[PDB]
């Protein structure tokens, strides 16, 4: 057992080296998780000298066997592996498959599975998921779940269990976007390092929501965990974020329930001002200047639909219930032939998103001439009012602005605030002046916040501040993979 193991691992034991030090890991574990288990948090430094971990926004470039600039999260641990830290900008110096399919479902959470289950009654589908497992956010929980009155992870197993050979599953697979060729849609997809082109008649974006990022002082430092990452390490791998854990944000109960299940000690800090520490977090300070000693901070401030795949697919947005949503016709369509389902549509219980996927799959099944009954899913859905999110009042005056990070790359809240103060309110321009939303997330974890700041400094309402649209490759792909 390593110090942060929640279980004794029974996988094949393996040995790796971090900065020369000999560490034990298990086969199949991903680099940052093996290092966490061994109490190692600080994995890289940004170009302007900011220490960083793997469990919040931003990329983790690491030298993995003399090969510079590999992404830590993507790398499985391997016996004899030589791992080292490096600069942010340090790079290394040194057979297309075509598959035709009826629908192409992007995203493998409850919505995606839902759609696939409905669809494979008669059609051939691609279920595309970049994640390596086929649950959704649901596979991150293991707490009993409403709707299917049954344990979160047990439901996923049941559902995956029910998939046909009519469903081609694509794990560890990144969709690069959707391209309408009139007669079909092209969804180019990357798995391992092969490019696969999926030509489909229909598409469904079952694309999910992403966790909102909280603005407080060293919010990027090692040992801060965004909700999803904390749940992943605890529930998927079985590793604690730390020995004693601070928890914050408006959905902190979801996290606390997991902590309690695993018996991980914690404090609940409703309003975080700052985190401090040399390599990692060791104190958090609240808005009343109270300090708490802890090894990690976990924040959970609500999920918001990931709008990138929507807007690259050519969909339009609406602001409602504290977040941006897809504008849909009466059939959950973004545009003719592209359906949207799940937490991509709105925030609501897993079961609801599951139904919406079935709903969306049923419409296309009806399109195809099969006798489906989308409305039974429709009427089940209405039983679930979509959730709201409070819009954050960022106490700008009360923060030391250069310490609070807005995006992954450079980009402090101060830089953004500065340009707004000089009159610029158009996010298009803000994007260019500061590098907000130009980093390796494409604004996923910062655009909305940038908007909130403009809105706050301006008085201009959020339902009027329109968002820069997502462009060509919605996910990072390198570049060799795309020739010839």
């Amino acid at each position: 057992m390593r110090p942060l193991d929640l279980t004794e691992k029974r996988g094949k034991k393996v040995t790796i080296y971090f900065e020369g030090k000999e560490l034990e890991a298990y086969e199949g574990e991903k680099l940052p998780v093996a290092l966490l288990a061994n109490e190692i948090y600080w994995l890289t430094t940004s170009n302007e000298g900011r220490k960083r971990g793997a469990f919040t926004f931003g990329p983790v470039p690491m030298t993995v066997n003399g090969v510079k600039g590999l992404e830590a999260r993507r790398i499985k641990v391997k016996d004899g592996m030589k791992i080292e830290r490096q600069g942010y900008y340090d790079f290394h110096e040194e057979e297309i498959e075509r598959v035709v399919v009826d629908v192409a479902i992007i995203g493998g959470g409850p919505a995606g599975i839902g759609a696939a289950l409905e669809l494979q009654q008669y059609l051939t589908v691609a279920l595309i998921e970049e994640r390596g497992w086929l649950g959704g956010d649901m596979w991150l929980k293991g707490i009993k779940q409403e709707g299917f009155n049954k344990d979160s992870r047990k439901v996923v197993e049941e559902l995956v269990g029910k998939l046909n050979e009519n469903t081609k599953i694509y794990l560890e697979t990144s969709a690069l976007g959707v391209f309408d060729k009139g007669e079909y849609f092209l969804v180019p997809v990357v798995r391992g390092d092969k490019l696969i082109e999926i030509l489909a008649k229909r598409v469904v974006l079952a694309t999910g929501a992403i966790d909102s990022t909280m603005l407080f002082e060293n919010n990027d430092m090692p040992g801060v965990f965004r909700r999803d990452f904390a749940l992943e390490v605890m529930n998927v791998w079985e590793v604690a974020p730390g020995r004693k854990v601070a928890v914050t944000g408006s959905k902190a109960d979801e996290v606390i329930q997991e902590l309690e299940r695993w018996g991980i000690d914690y404090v609940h800090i409703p309003n975080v001002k700052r985190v401090e520490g040399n390599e990692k977090v060791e104190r958090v300070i609240d808005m009343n200047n109270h300090e708490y000693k802890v090894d990690a901070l976990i924040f959970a401030d609500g999920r918001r639909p990931d709008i990138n795949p929507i807007t690259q697919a050519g969909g339009k947005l609406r602001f409602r219930r504290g977040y941006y949503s897809p504008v849909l016709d009466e059939y959950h369509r973004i545009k003719d032939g592209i359906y949207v389902a799940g937490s991509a549509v709105s925030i609501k219980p897993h079961y609801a998103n599951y139904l919406e996927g079935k709903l969306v799959g049923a419409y296309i099944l009806k399109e195809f001439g099969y006798d489906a009954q989308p409305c039974i899913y429709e009427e089940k859905l209405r039983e679930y009012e979509p959730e709201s999110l409070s819009i954050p009042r960022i106490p700008l005056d009360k923060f030391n602005l250069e310490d609070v990070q807005i995006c992954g790359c450079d980009v402090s809240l101060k830089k953004v605030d500065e340009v707004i103060r000089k009159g610029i309110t158009d996010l298009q321009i803000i994007k260019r002046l500061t590098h907000l939303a130009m980093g390796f997330c494409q604004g996923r974890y910062c655009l909305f916040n940038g908007a909130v700041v403009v809105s706050q400094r301006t008085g201009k309402k959020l339902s009027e501040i329109d968002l820069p649209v997502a462009r060509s490759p919605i996910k990072n792909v390198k570049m060799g993979i795309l020739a010839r």
């Binding site: 340090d90 110096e93 260019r432 590098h435 490759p473 570049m479 060799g480 993979i481």
Partner: protein, 374 residues
């Protein structure tokens, strides 16, 4: 919103503001009218300029001059223009002969371009794959600059010198009395003026239409595209590297560290932006042929913008005689950012003296109907 103005420049991109800028520092009173923000449009989607390696006297003289103005204003207003060179990679005797010939004409007019060696080309840009390059055209006084940074700079100076820059203000029509311009009709009232300049390149036709110009000045918007990679160590790729053989690829590194670039891949006369999968594939193929290390680099985003094309890839810059005090500076066909400082100077002189130091007549608005393509 002013209600009278001696001169009205339509369009507030690099060209529009750069023209205003010259007129204003020359003591003249100018207001620019931009329908969105200063520097939106192609200038906002633009690569990083700036080149003197052209193939005819006029363009070479204009760009020589232009580069002098880039040096001057760059340091004088503090906006940053690195002279890292332009590097044309050559692969066969066909190309070598042609460039030997281009360089010759460049030299005559004071642009000291050299034909160089593969290993020399690889000293500059160490990551260049040199295996099938047989020579390269090199000029160390070509460079790159951020079109947005540079436009905003010229903009605040133009205002300082007394120009009015009107932002969410669209031109919709003209008050034309006899053949006199009397006013420019907008979405926010009419402005009285006798002299107007059309600097809306991709939109030039629209402005020409509103003015009732009957002279054929064919300027079509075409969709060109660009890619940006993840940031990389500073000074990894310094000059603009061009490869005609590999799909009219151009690539260089941004000041942020990016490595930006595009290829020839043109999409027929359209106002559509929105990038395409086919461009994504092609740029990846071409770039990685030219510098192989790019294979290990993440692509972050892709975008599109207009080339405002004419049949001979040269702008239309001149006085239109049949409308009284109508000028055009539009249709820069992909290289209008680099020209801007110089065309500013030219247009100012036209307005102001009736003739120009530089050979502005190469860009004659009337050449097309007359059948005289360059």
């Amino acid at each position: 919103l002013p209600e009278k103005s001696e001169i009205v420049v339509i369009g507030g991109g690099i060209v529009g503001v750069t023209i205003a800028h010259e007129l204003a520092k020359r003591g003249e009173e100018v207001t620019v009218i931009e329908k969105r923000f200063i520097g939106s449009g192609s200038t906002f989607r633009c690569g990083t300029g700036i080149r003197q390696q052209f193939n005819d006297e006029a363009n070479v003289r204009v760009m020589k001059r232009s580069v002098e103005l880039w040096k001057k204003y760059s340091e004088e207003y503090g906006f940053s223009f690195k002279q890292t060179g332009y590097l044309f990679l050559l692969y066969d005797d066909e190309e070598v002969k042609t460039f030997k010939r281009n360089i010759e004409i460049q030299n005559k007019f004071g642009v000291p371009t050299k034909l160089i060696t593969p290993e020399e080309a690889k000293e500059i840009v160490p990551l260049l794959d040199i295996s099938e390059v047989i020579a390269a055209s090199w000029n160390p006084t070509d460079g790159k600059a951020d079109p947005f940074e540079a436009t905003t700079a010229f903009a605040v100076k133009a205002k300082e010198y007394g120009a009015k820059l009107l932002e969410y203000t669209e031109v919709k029509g003209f008050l034309i009395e006899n053949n006199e311009i009397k006013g420019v009709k907008t979405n926010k009232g009419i402005i009285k003026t006798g002299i107007v300049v059309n600097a809306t390149n991709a939109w030039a036709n629209l402005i020409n239409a509103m003015a009732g110009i009957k002279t054929k000045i064919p300027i079509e918007p075409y969709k060109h595209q660009a890619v940006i990679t993840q940031p990389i160590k500073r000074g990894t790729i310094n000059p603009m590297v061009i490869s005609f053989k590999y799909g009219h690829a151009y690539l260089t590194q941004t000041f942020h560290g990016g490595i930006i670039g595009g290829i020839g891949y043109e999409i027929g006369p359209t106002y559509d932006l929105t990038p395409t999968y086919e461009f994504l594939r092609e740029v990846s193929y071409y770039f990685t042929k030219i510098i192989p290390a790019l294979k290990n680099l993440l692509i972050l985003r892709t975008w599109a913008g207009y080339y405002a094309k004419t049949p001979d890839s040269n702008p239309a810059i001149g006085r239109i005689e049949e409308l009284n005090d109508y000028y055009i500076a539009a249709g820069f066909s992909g290289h209008g950012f680099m020209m801007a400082p110089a065309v500013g100077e030219m247009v100012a002189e036209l307005i102001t003296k009736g003739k120009t130091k530089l050979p502005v007549e190469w860009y004659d608005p009337y050449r097309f109907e007359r059948g005289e393509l360059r």
